[PDB]
Design an enzyme around this catalytic site. Structure first.
Site, PDB file in Angstrom:
ATOM      1  N   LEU A  23      30.326  43.413  31.670  1.00 51.69           N
ATOM      2  CA  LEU A  23      31.487  44.270  30.748  1.00 51.69           C
ATOM      3  C   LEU A  23      31.721  45.519  31.361  1.00 51.69           C
ATOM      4  O   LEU A  23      30.293  46.302  31.038  1.00 51.69           O
ATOM      5  CB  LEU A  23      32.281  43.854  29.981  1.00 51.69           C
ATOM      6  CG  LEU A  23      31.616  42.369  29.711  1.00 51.69           C
ATOM      7  CD1 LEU A  23      32.504  42.045  28.222  1.00 51.69           C
ATOM      8  CD2 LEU A  23      32.296  41.142  30.402  1.00 51.69           C
ATOM      9  N   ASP A  66      24.963  41.134  29.393  1.00 52.03           N
ATOM     10  CA  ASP A  66      25.073  42.961  28.654  1.00 52.03           C
ATOM     11  C   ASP A  66      23.826  42.181  27.864  1.00 52.03           C
ATOM     12  O   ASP A  66      23.549  43.099  26.224  1.00 52.03           O
ATOM     13  CB  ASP A  66      26.573  42.563  27.915  1.00 52.03           C
ATOM     14  CG  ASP A  66      27.704  43.556  29.060  1.00 52.03           C
ATOM     15  OD1 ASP A  66      28.437  42.737  29.018  1.00 52.03           O
ATOM     16  OD2 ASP A  66      27.050  44.654  29.445  1.00 52.03           O
ATOM     17  N   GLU A  71      21.545  46.594  20.079  1.00 47.85           N
ATOM     18  CA  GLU A  71      22.212  46.936  18.903  1.00 47.85           C
ATOM     19  C   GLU A  71      23.832  45.958  18.854  1.00 47.85           C
ATOM     20  O   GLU A  71      23.833  45.845  17.688  1.00 47.85           O
ATOM     21  CB  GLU A  71      22.997  48.589  19.178  1.00 47.85           C
ATOM     22  CG  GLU A  71      23.506  49.232  18.202  1.00 47.85           C
ATOM     23  CD  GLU A  71      23.946  50.885  17.130  1.00 47.85           C
ATOM     24  OE1 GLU A  71      23.227  51.187  17.118  1.00 47.85           O
ATOM     25  OE2 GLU A  71      25.079  51.052  19.165  1.00 47.85           O
ATOM     26  N   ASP A  72      24.742  45.843  19.620  1.00 47.37           N
ATOM     27  CA  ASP A  72      25.838  45.230  18.830  1.00 47.37           C
ATOM     28  C   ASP A  72      25.805  43.569  18.519  1.00 47.37           C
ATOM     29  O   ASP A  72      26.401  42.890  18.171  1.00 47.37           O
ATOM     30  CB  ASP A  72      26.659  44.935  20.481  1.00 47.37           C
ATOM     31  CG  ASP A  72      26.739  46.310  21.276  1.00 47.37           C
ATOM     32  OD1 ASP A  72      27.350  47.338  20.068  1.00 47.37           O
ATOM     33  OD2 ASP A  72      26.984  46.859  21.920  1.00 47.37           O
ATOM     34  N   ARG A  91      28.903  37.617  24.840  1.00 47.78           N
ATOM     35  CA  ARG A  91      27.791  38.003  24.565  1.00 47.78           C
ATOM     36  C   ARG A  91      26.857  37.686  23.462  1.00 47.78           C
ATOM     37  O   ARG A  91      26.868  37.806  22.881  1.00 47.78           O
ATOM     38  CB  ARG A  91      28.311  39.387  23.964  1.00 47.78           C
ATOM     39  CG  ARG A  91      29.041  39.979  25.321  1.00 47.78           C
ATOM     40  CD  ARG A  91      28.650  41.914  25.052  1.00 47.78           C
ATOM     41  NE  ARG A  91      27.298  41.607  24.586  1.00 47.78           N
ATOM     42  CZ  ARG A  91      26.778  43.303  23.870  1.00 47.78           C
ATOM     43  NH1 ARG A  91      27.882  43.906  23.221  1.00 47.78           N
ATOM     44  NH2 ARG A  91      25.409  43.289  23.613  1.00 47.78           N
ATOM     45  N   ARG A 138      36.655  45.482  19.285  1.00 48.64           N
ATOM     46  CA  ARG A 138      35.054  45.220  19.325  1.00 48.64           C
ATOM     47  C   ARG A 138      35.009  44.280  17.891  1.00 48.64           C
ATOM     48  O   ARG A 138      34.332  43.552  17.798  1.00 48.64           O
ATOM     49  CB  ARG A 138      34.200  45.292  19.889  1.00 48.64           C
ATOM     50  CG  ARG A 138      33.815  45.338  21.119  1.00 48.64           C
ATOM     51  CD  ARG A 138      34.227  44.080  22.444  1.00 48.64           C
ATOM     52  NE  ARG A 138      34.033  44.241  23.857  1.00 48.64           N
ATOM     53  CZ  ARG A 138      32.866  44.262  24.280  1.00 48.64           C
ATOM     54  NH1 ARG A 138      31.515  45.165  23.948  1.00 48.64           N
ATOM     55  NH2 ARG A 138      33.368  44.627  25.841  1.00 48.64           N
ATOM     56  N   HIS A 166      33.300  52.114  21.405  1.00 51.30           N
ATOM     57  CA  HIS A 166      32.508  51.930  19.764  1.00 51.30           C
ATOM     58  C   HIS A 166      32.984  53.335  18.876  1.00 51.30           C
ATOM     59  O   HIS A 166      33.354  54.420  19.715  1.00 51.30           O
ATOM     60  CB  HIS A 166      31.447  51.222  20.025  1.00 51.30           C
ATOM     61  CG  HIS A 166      31.118  49.941  20.274  1.00 51.30           C
ATOM     62  ND1 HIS A 166      30.326  49.365  21.263  1.00 51.30           N
ATOM     63  CD2 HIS A 166      31.772  48.879  19.753  1.00 51.30           C
ATOM     64  CE1 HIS A 166      30.306  48.692  21.432  1.00 51.30           C
ATOM     65  NE2 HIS A 166      31.357  47.810  20.424  1.00 51.30           N
ATOM     66  N   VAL A 261      28.756  51.177  32.603  1.00 53.30           N
ATOM     67  CA  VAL A 261      28.711  49.792  31.857  1.00 53.30           C
ATOM     68  C   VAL A 261      28.855  49.950  30.329  1.00 53.30           C
ATOM     69  O   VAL A 261      28.824  49.290  28.850  1.00 53.30           O
ATOM     70  CB  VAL A 261      28.072  48.510  32.190  1.00 53.30           C
ATOM     71  CG1 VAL A 261      28.160  48.215  33.499  1.00 53.30           C
ATOM     72  CG2 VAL A 261      26.696  48.814  32.034  1.00 53.30           C
ATOM     73  N   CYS A 267      22.310  52.382  21.628  1.00 56.90           N
ATOM     74  CA  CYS A 267      23.418  50.535  22.002  1.00 56.90           C
ATOM     75  C   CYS A 267      21.693  49.693  22.181  1.00 56.90           C
ATOM     76  O   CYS A 267      21.910  48.461  22.337  1.00 56.90           O
ATOM     77  CB  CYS A 267      24.090  50.866  23.266  1.00 56.90           C
ATOM     78  SG  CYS A 267      25.227  51.581  23.071  1.00 56.90           S
TER      79      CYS A 267
HETATM   80  C1  LIG Z   1      27.170  50.675  22.294  1.00 54.03           C
HETATM   81  N1  LIG Z   1      26.596  50.043  20.988  1.00 54.03           N
HETATM   82  C2  LIG Z   1      27.784  51.646  22.042  1.00 54.03           C
HETATM   83  C3  LIG Z   1      28.763  51.663  20.485  1.00 54.03           C
HETATM   84  N2  LIG Z   1      27.041  49.221  22.454  1.00 54.03           N
HETATM   85  C4  LIG Z   1      28.157  49.355  24.736  1.00 54.03           C
HETATM   86  C5  LIG Z   1      27.859  48.202  24.799  1.00 54.03           C
HETATM   87  C6  LIG Z   1      28.633  47.860  26.393  1.00 54.03           C
HETATM   88  C7  LIG Z   1      28.426  46.470  27.051  1.00 54.03           C
HETATM   89  N3  LIG Z   1      29.224  46.312  28.515  1.00 54.03           N
HETATM   90  C8  LIG Z   1      29.868  45.933  26.169  1.00 54.03           C
HETATM   91  O1  LIG Z   1      29.286  45.356  25.003  1.00 54.03           O
HETATM   92  O2  LIG Z   1      31.193  45.745  26.338  1.00 54.03           O
END
Ligand SMILES: *[C@@](=[N])([C][C])[N][C][C][C][C]([N])C([O])=O
EC number: 3.5.3.18
Length: 275
Positions: A23, A66, A71-72, A91, A138, A166, A261, A267
């Site tokens: 993404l 992804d 981190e996410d 994800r 998100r 973010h 991306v 991240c």
């Molecule tokens: C980082 N934590 C930035 C805040 N995450 C980026 C995630 C990028 C990924 N391609 C997505 O989740 O779309």
């Protein structure tokens, strides 16, 4: 027990499928997956090799373009690990291998199962004394609340996030009581809404480029202040500002491919202090 103190990092190898299937908020240039693999290996190399952190390196899944943005998928505070429910439905199966690896580190795991609540880790800023959670495409209100409860030990406050980003797409911690902040209008607004909401005043490290406000700050033994920042080839005017932080062990780290991306420095890992 210092802010920024870490013993382990959890990282995940990027899949070949990231090149064409990750993404990305906007159309850009072609991803050199090789170059992105190098850049990732150099990122992991700083944390593990250079800085002494024990690194947990998870295998790339191809069906999860992804997966490298760990981190996410998790938010760690003290000895507790909040396993999120990402904004991106596709994800959510990254949750699984992260969960199982946080279990091997003996962390207190709390899972975000609430079918209505979403939270990307990148939307979470933890200053060491409280939590600021971005509300975005998100992360939702309900997601913020679950986080607020998992860490009842800490004040949580929310701030509204724009476009397809973010909260940490324009900020992060540059040291104890120092938030790295972008110069844009959107970034300044965010910060000021954050400022009003705390019983504490944070010092600000303002940089020209919003993306370069995203750095990693660590307090590693025998070293003290350590900061991984976007290289001068990438954002020269932002690197100028970090360069002034003289008591900080400045390490330039490139993230140009993954940036395509929307990947920044924070991240790509989850940091952990195991005492
Ligand atoms: C980082 N934590 C930035 C805040 N995450 C980026 C995630 C990028 C990924 N391609 C997505 O989740 O779309």
């Amino acid at each position: 027990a210092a802010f920024g103190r870490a013993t382990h990092a959890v990282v995940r190898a990027l899949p070949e499928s990231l090149g064409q299937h990750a993404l990305r908020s906007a159309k850009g240039e072609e991803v050199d997956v090789a170059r992105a693999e190098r850049q990732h290996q150099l990122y992991v190399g700083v944390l593990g090799s250079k800085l002494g952190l024990q690194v947990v390196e998870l295998p790339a899944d191809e069906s999860l373009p992804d997966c490298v943005f760990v981190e996410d998928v998790a938010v760690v505070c003290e000895e507790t690990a909040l396993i999120t429910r990402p904004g991106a439905p596709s994800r959510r199966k990254e949750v699984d291998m992260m969960k199982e690896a946080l279990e091997k580190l003996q962390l207190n795991i709390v899972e975000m199962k609430d079918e209505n609540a979403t939270l990307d880790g990148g939307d979470v800023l933890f200053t060491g004394r409280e939590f600021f959670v971005g509300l975005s495409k998100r992360t939702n209100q309900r997601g913020a609340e679950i986080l607020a409860d998992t860490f009842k030990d800490y004040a949580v406050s929310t701030v509204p996030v724009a476009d397809g980003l973010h909260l940490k797409s324009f900020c992060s911690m540059a040291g104890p009581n120092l938030i790295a902040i972008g110069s844009s209008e959107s970034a300044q607004k965010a910060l000021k809404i954050m400022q009003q909401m705390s019983d504490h005043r944070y010092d600000k490290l303002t940089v020209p480029d919003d993306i370069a406000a995203n750095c990693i700050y660590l307090n590693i033994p025998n070293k003290g202040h350590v900061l991984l920042h976007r290289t001068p080839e990438e954002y020269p005017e932002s690197a100028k500002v970090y360069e002034k932080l003289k008591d900080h062990m400045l390490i330039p780290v490139s993230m140009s491919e993954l940036e395509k991306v929307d990947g920044l420095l924070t991240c790509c890992s989850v940091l952990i202090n195991k005492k």
